[PDB]
Hints:
2 copies of one chain form a homodimer.
Chain A: E1 2-10, H1 28-35, E2 46-47, E3 56-66, H2 75-82, E4 87-95, E5 107-116, E6 129-131, H3 137-147, E7 149-152, E8 165-177, E9 182-190, H4 197-209, H5 217-224, E10 239-245
Parallel strand pairs in A: 3-10, 5-6
Antiparallel strand pairs in A: 1-3, 1-4, 2-3, 5-9, 5-10, 7-8, 8-9
Helix pairs in contact in A: 3-4
Amino acid sequence: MRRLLLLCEYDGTLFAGLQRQGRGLRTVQGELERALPGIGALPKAVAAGRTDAGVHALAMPFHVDVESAIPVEKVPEALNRLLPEDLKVVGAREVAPDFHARKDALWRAYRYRILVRPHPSPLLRHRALWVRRPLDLEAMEEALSLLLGRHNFLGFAKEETRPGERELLEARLQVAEGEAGLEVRLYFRGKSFLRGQVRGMVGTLLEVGLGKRPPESLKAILKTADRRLAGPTAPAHGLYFVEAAYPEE
Amino acid sequence: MRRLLLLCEYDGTLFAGLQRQGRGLRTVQGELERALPGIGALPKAVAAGRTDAGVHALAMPFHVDVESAIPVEKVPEALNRLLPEDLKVVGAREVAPDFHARKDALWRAYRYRILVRPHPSPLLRHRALWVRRPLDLEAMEEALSLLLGRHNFLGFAKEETRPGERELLEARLQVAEGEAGLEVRLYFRGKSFLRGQVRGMVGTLLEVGLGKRPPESLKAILKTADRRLAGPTAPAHGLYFVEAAYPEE
């Protein structure tokens, strides 16, 4: 009837992930679908992607179909009265009846935040990875550059097996000296990502930043695509799905 | 026996306040004193100030007495293994056995965060005051200016019995366009503050920013020290105790 693109922000700490999983488990998709009826929409939400348990989102897109006559500009506010405090709709747009949040996406962007300081931070404990040791940003930037472009990224995926060639469009490191302390931010942009990939890339880069054979080691993992050569997956609370882009119309 | 000056950071949302309040409530003092014996210290902590339920601190000073031989360098880590996830020591320094965190403070600084944006922010729901309507930033600065200097701030106070005269050294607005929206930070620094004073000044300022008689109306509040004229107290989650300064002696 009317199909809308909903942008959602969520604190993923108290969710078992985005995808609805059954057996009572609390999920982002589950909670958005639980509230769609309240606005005259079918209880079905198709997401642009999938976030693991604990990972956050700034503007995760979902398309939904509303039977009702609610004006678009009224949808966020209305769904927000119904949604829990850790998941809110921060935008809505009328799209083509044809629109598909997952398939029509040009690209997806993620951001990982590391907070470098002598002591843990109660204020940012679920928002950034606390790292006590000094970090070698130069070694990290040289490894980051190895990841750019067309590669088989399976060496960084998780329970992933599937056709692994992806093309990383962007992989940059930013240091922003916040008050809660100094932060190192890793940004990644690509059409799509393997499941677990970003957290995978981040854990090995972190190893680079401390001590772990130089950026050089990342060429083997990209070449062979052998998971046992990467480092451990970075914790979920420092990861954020930033946004997805779609072609005009 | 040594007297140490501890600096603590805490997420105030799951605390009834800083000082003990009985009634079996969880407070910052309670939890710190709970941990202190694991370091061979007397289970007593005196803070530089007070924070209501929900308000935060980046560096709240506390003085404690340690009996053990523990090196100053090691107490933040030792206390942190024992403390809850929402409260940690981020600094420790030996001082005079005669040092008083509250009485010897030259000044205290506070910061309040307002985030102006169309929709709520689940990620910053316990860190900034969400405000939808734009803020007359001009009026707020005019009002802020009327607050600087020596006055009887009891009109901004709540349940205080001390002498109302204080000297507000700094009172400034800082706006930054940010990723989560427009960040409006209010900063205050004075020798000391009355109970509820900072939240009352912030609450009256929000009214100005939104539509409270002009900034002028704060004159009446300072002259008469009548709290009946002040605005509602500001929600706690946007307030942060930043730091305190002591004399080098």
